């Protein structure tokens, strides 16, 4: 119900501060723009699913869709023009191998629909972050439209392999749970960033997306062994994903308050000196945020506390919704890490 100039003006008015009736109109303008991607998003999820079912007759390629939350869009404008964004709507196809990935990419390219691939982002050679896969940026209803309100809606399609998705899930889990910002920054955490780049490169080599020479492989595994022991990646992935699994537990869910929208203080304790070795989740209310931060910072003094992290229940639920197979993906990345670290 709004014009593209009205939507661009509303995004500007949110970046520039807004209040009251002016804000309600601006948030309605951007919310309208956001739910305009819902139809082409659900459409592209079915177009992609149809292609995946022709590529793998066994129906094992996993297809998913995700619409960026209104809250996430406003926070990006508060803290890349709105109408020029390709990530508002995104689809993801997870295939078993590089062969199956290239077949599905070609099936989508050769296909003839009103939905055009504007750019093909080939990341079979890992990005500086370590990420590998292929992204197809679509302009749905690009030329053939008519009285179509969804003319030129941008939807991104990410094609990735089971191991490339295992790498991406583990990155998202460490990034979100450790509260560090690898994805939304170009600085800090050198050991985490370098660990993800090298492991990403090893994923691309193993998958056959970017084969590296024997010497580089050897050097990359020594670097990886060193980075993994320094950061304790395997131990953290197991603890964080088990703690997330524990939040979805029936006994825990019955003990929690109604529509709990708070925090979970995840810990790993070595009180074995003989004592006990445990992993605990402690829930907090939304009002008890500071009390929760005070308990988290108090554990730095405790030598028994090996892992201590504060998780918002909204971050937990969205990670489980965006990565339904996070338990398995994480374990498959740790097994991958283990087989490269035990080489020499
Ligand atoms: Cl998943
Ligand atoms: Na409490």
Numbering used by the authors: 14 to 92, 104 to 297, 303 to 373
Q: What did the publication describing this PDB structure actually write?
A:
To further understand the mechanistic basis of anti-phage defence by CapRelSJ46, we solved a crystal structure to 2.3 Å resolution. CapRelSJ46 contains a conserved, N-terminal nucleotide pyrophosphokinase domain (toxSYNTH) that is also present in alarmone synthetases and tRNA-pyrophosphotransferase enzymes, which mediates toxicity. The smaller C-terminal antitoxin domain consists of a central antiparallel three-stranded β-sheet with an α-helix connecting β-strands β7 and β8. The antitoxin domain is topologically analogous to the classical zinc-finger domain (ZFD), but lacks the conserved cysteines; we refer to this domain as a pseudo-ZFD. The pseudo-ZFD is connected to the toxSYNTH domain via α-helices α7, α8 and α9, and has a C-terminal α-helical extension that anchors the domain to α8 and α9. In this structure, the toxSYNTH and pseudo-ZFD are distant from each other, revealing the ATP donor nucleotide binding pocket and the conserved G-loop Y155 of toxSYNTH, indicating that this state may represent the active, toxic conformation of CapRelSJ46. This open state captured by crystallography is probably stabilized by crystal lattice contacts that are incompatible with a closing of the active site owing to clashes with symmetry-related partners. In addition to predicting the open conformation observed in the crystal structure, AlphaFold also predicted a closed conformational state in which the C-terminal domain folds back 110° onto the toxSYNTH central β-sheet and blocks the ATP-binding site. The crystal structure of CapRelSJ46 suggested that L280 and L307 in the wild-type protein promote the open, active state, with L280 stabilizing one of the hinge regions involving the pseudo-ZFD and L307 structuring the β6–β7 loop that interacts with Gp57 A-domain. Collectively, our results indicate that the pseudo-ZFD docks onto the ATP-binding site of CapRelSJ46 to prevent switching to the open state captured in our crystal structure.
Here we identify and investigate the anti-phage function of CapRelSJ46, a fused toxin–antitoxin system that protects Escherichia coli against diverse phages. Using genetic, biochemical and structural analyses, we demonstrate that the C-terminal domain of CapRelSJ46 regulates the toxic N-terminal region, serving as both antitoxin and phage infection sensor. Following infection by certain phages, newly synthesized major capsid protein binds directly to the C-terminal domain of CapRelSJ46 to relieve autoinhibition, enabling the toxin domain to pyrophosphorylate tRNAs, which blocks translation to restrict viral infection. Collectively, our results reveal the molecular mechanism by which a bacterial immune system directly senses a conserved, essential component of phages, suggesting a PAMP-like sensing model for toxin–antitoxin-mediated innate immunity in bacteria.
